[PDB]
Design an enzyme around this catalytic site. Structure first.
Site, short mmCIF file in Angstrom:
data_model
loop_
_atom_site.label_atom_id
_atom_site.label_comp_id
_atom_site.label_asym_id
_atom_site.label_seq_id
_atom_site.Cartn_x
_atom_site.Cartn_y
_atom_site.Cartn_z
N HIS A 195 0.80 -1.22 0.00
CA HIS A 195 0.00 0.00 0.00
C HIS A 195 0.82 1.25 0.00
O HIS A 195 1.99 1.23 0.45
CB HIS A 195 -0.98 0.05 1.19
CG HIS A 195 -0.38 0.55 2.47
ND1 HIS A 195 -0.25 1.91 2.75
CD2 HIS A 195 0.03 -0.11 3.58
CE1 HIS A 195 0.21 2.05 3.98
NE2 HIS A 195 0.38 0.84 4.51
N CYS A 196 0.23 2.33 -0.49
CA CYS A 196 0.93 3.64 -0.43
C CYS A 196 -0.14 4.56 0.10
O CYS A 196 -0.83 4.15 1.05
CB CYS A 196 1.55 4.01 -1.81
SG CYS A 196 0.35 4.36 -3.19
#
Length: 159
Positions: free
Chosen positions: A95-96
């Site tokens: 994830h970012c």
């Protein structure tokens, strides 16, 4: 969050609360590759180590490899990321902040290495589950290099 390969690897943005992290557990996530920089994580969690301790307290083993927004991992970080992702096949979440650029880049990279997909096929596959995946020219150039150097990456991942 979305799966690119059902229950083996998917993506997402930054959770805002602990309830969203439990939603990941319920979906089958077991390990999390955390891509934002400290300050991005801190906008929602105040302290980067506290956010990681929350992942940890929730049964998720996290690995933090900060990549700047719009950027790509250095060769060194990429090796670490792929060694990590290839270490356990199931339940990987990457994830970012929004779930699209950095995250889509790493997911497409994963597909190129593990399935031998050409760069345009990898990008398409991720875009089908995550519209807009792979946002910048630097990211697109990086994926063509991953395809071009596929055998050298695999050789370095498994030494």
């Amino acid at each position: 969050m979305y799966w690119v390969r059902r229950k083996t690897i998917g993506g997402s943005g930054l959770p805002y609360t602990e309830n969203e992290i439990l939603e990941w557990r319920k979906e089958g996530v077991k390990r999390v590759l955390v891509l934002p920089e400290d300050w991005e994580i801190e906008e929602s969690w105040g302290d980067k180590d506290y956010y990681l301790s929350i992942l940890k307290k929730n049964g998720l083993q996290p690995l933090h490899i900060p990549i700047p927004d719009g950027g790509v991992p250095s060769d060194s970080q990429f090796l670490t990321i792929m060694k990590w992702l290839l270490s356990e096949k199931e339940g990987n979440l990457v994830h970012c902040v929004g779930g699209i650029g950095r995250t889509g880049t790493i997911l497409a990279s994963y597909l190129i290495l593990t399935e031998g997909l050409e760069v345009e096929s990898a990008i398409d596959e991720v875009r089908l589950v995550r519209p807009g995946a792979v946002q910048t020219y630097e990211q697109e150039m990086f994926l063509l290099r991953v395809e071009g150097m596929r055998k050298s990456w695999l050789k370095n991942i498994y030494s």
